[PDB]
Symmetry: D3
């Protein structure tokens, strides 16, 4: 068996989102990014000549990205945000008493503590493994999945899981 490593990356694996960083003793102003996601994996070349079909990887990266795209990214588990439900909005109050309010539908609530590149990457890695399907990955012999998320062209975080 011959090992190969596949990489899929594209301006199309994008989610254009608003966010702000907040942690103890610090709060950034509201802003946004064209986040970009690449996926790298490793398996054996199968009898059909692929480790896994690029088209499927492109399809599922696109799908995960599309869920986040055009939303404010709202961390569910932050210890420094007070997140209130007010009518059809989320009202967010910070430790410096700064206050924000967005329509709930404008927000994507993600099970992370900080809208950092690192934590977004871990979330996307887990979602990608679910969307492509872990049993399907194993039928193709894939044993390594790795996600890189960039906030901008100049700063990236990369996380992996051995499967």
């Amino acid at each position: 068996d011959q090992i190969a490593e596949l990489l899929v990356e594209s301006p199309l694996f994008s989610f254009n989102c608003a966010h702000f960083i907040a942690f103890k003793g610090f709060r950034a102003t509201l802003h946004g990014h064209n986040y970009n996601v690449s996926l790298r994996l490793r398996g054996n070349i199968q009898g059909d000549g692929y480790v896994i079909d690029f088209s499927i990887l492109k399809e599922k990266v696109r799908k995960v990205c599309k869920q986040l795209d055009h939303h404010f990214i709202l961390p569910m588990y932050s210890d420094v945000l007070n997140i209130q439900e007010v009518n059809d909005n989320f009202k967010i109050t910070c430790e410096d008493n700064s206050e924000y309010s967005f329509p709930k539908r404008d927000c994507v609530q993600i099970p992370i503590k900080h809208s950092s590149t690192e934590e977004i990457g871990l979330y996307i890695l887990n979602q990608l493994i679910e969307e492509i399907d872990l049993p399907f990955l194993k039928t193709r012999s894939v044993n390594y999945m790795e996600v890189t998320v960039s906030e901008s062209p100049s700063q990236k975080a990369t996380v992996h899981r051995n499967i």
Copy 2:
């Protein structure tokens, strides 16, 4: 006299901002972009061997970009937004009755009608001409200034002025 056209462009001429599009009968969800700005100009090669020093162009593009960077871009002259001052926030109400509220300090109020790439480009062109200084441009023989703004790598608007 020999004409030359200068172009300055960089991942550094960036402003990472939140915005949303709204015009009659339409409203986008809140999101954001890594906007990128390039500047192109035309003049004669001067006795010092430059049309104008690249370093100055880089300095002033950086300065304009830095004013917008890390803010929500708020159009001053929109006919479809109701912009209210509430304590230290701007409260924005849309035609579909969607409601947003941001700290005023998180916002940059710009004299445009829509936070589109085109209108942002016209604004930045005017600001760049002021920052570099129109008389200084004319001492260097510059007769054309042109700004390109990209919302993402795949979509750009370009505006110019003959000076």
Copy 3:
């Protein structure tokens, strides 16, 4: 009224095709390219804040590209190819008596003389104007349409029409 120039470009505006160059006294071997298409246009900024919506330009460039993608590009009007219909294939005979045969369904017959970048560009420009629709372009005030086609990252042809 303020003029703006819009550019849309992307790794997504691609057609991955086979072709070969043939003209009098010359014939290239069969090969292929990831062709890439960009579109540039000029009009006035409309009351909605756009010259024309980027999404529409992306949609129609994608559509034209998709018709050509994954096919052998077969020039209809070449003076140096003998193109024969044999069962469900096109058989192509060159001036040096070289012979090719492809399933007709693997081929896209294009009303050009040479599968050059220049002639492909003129064809795509005409198709893009039809797909976006010339009357619709004029309602948005667009007066200039320009297509760039690249055979590879290092060689491009650009054609335009004043409308």
Copy 4:
């Protein structure tokens, strides 16, 4: 001894080829790509200050690429193609009875089963090791050779050998 990893990559390490994918129960239409090859290696920094001279790596990557460039890539060992020699052409018949015919000189016969990126990568890795020369690599202390092949900017396969 200090380890260093060298990477050579360029738009010049290209082969612009036609191909089609075929495996059991599937056949793509004829098309093509600007394939691109990068080479990465690891060794110790030698007394001359190089692990190995970049110029040699560039020379040999260029040479391998040039053998494939401007040809139809024909897999020698496919279990789903019937490859016939007819006069000075190869006639290829697929499982769905689709038929192709190319001049033999337009084709490069490669000892692979599928013209996939993965299998092309393994072939190029083996050829690069022969062209640079395995004993010469070992005199420079190189212990790792790795090839990345891209079908297009957005999809790549990477293979390696420990030497």
Copy 5:
């Protein structure tokens, strides 16, 4: 007749040179750049399907670049450098009495006043027109030649001539 505009550009159209800027009241320290050159032209599509063959443009841009590559660029006509021939070296004395000495063979003497991007561009434009040959350009119907030179990815000068 249909007009087309051709562009050739590549990491290969490079000259990696040392230089320093000097003009009245100013002198930069010795340093260097990977200069990059692109060529754009305009003519009619000819009966062979090309305005002019890309391969020729690539060949001649390469040739001009190769003459400059791996040398110190020495302006022949500077009003602020004292250039002395000392044995087999050029000794250069600046207005601040700074002194440099290089082997003559390490230098390329260019008929410019300043080693600026603008003046280098004008020189390369003139050399490219000579290398491709002005009569040959006119037989292909080319009526516009334009050169862009970049000192680094972020700063470029563009010059043209109507022929």
Copy 6:
């Protein structure tokens, strides 16, 4: 604890320098490059949501690059250069008796043997670890630091240290 790998890279992490290669039996002519530096590291995601703040990495890469930028890179420990102090210049004599002279202030003396990409990379890795501060790195849980230096877009050397 979750591991993440951070990458910072930018056209801004540049030093535009002159140099020449010399080793036993060989000497290159004087020339230069836009060198580019990227930094990759690995640690655990901290309670603030970062492995380490990108801004600090960008700040210190910039600082190291700025020390080298706009200078001739002069290796301190070369066995094939005779480096003489003459008034306020360094005079360099090669094994073929070629002679150079530069103002000392135009030169950066680096504790390397060859101005190769590999040795420059090892030097920059060591300097980056000092500038960011090794104890500070360990408080953020960083256990791996890796530097890539490119002489041009097409040739790179990568070195690392486990900390």
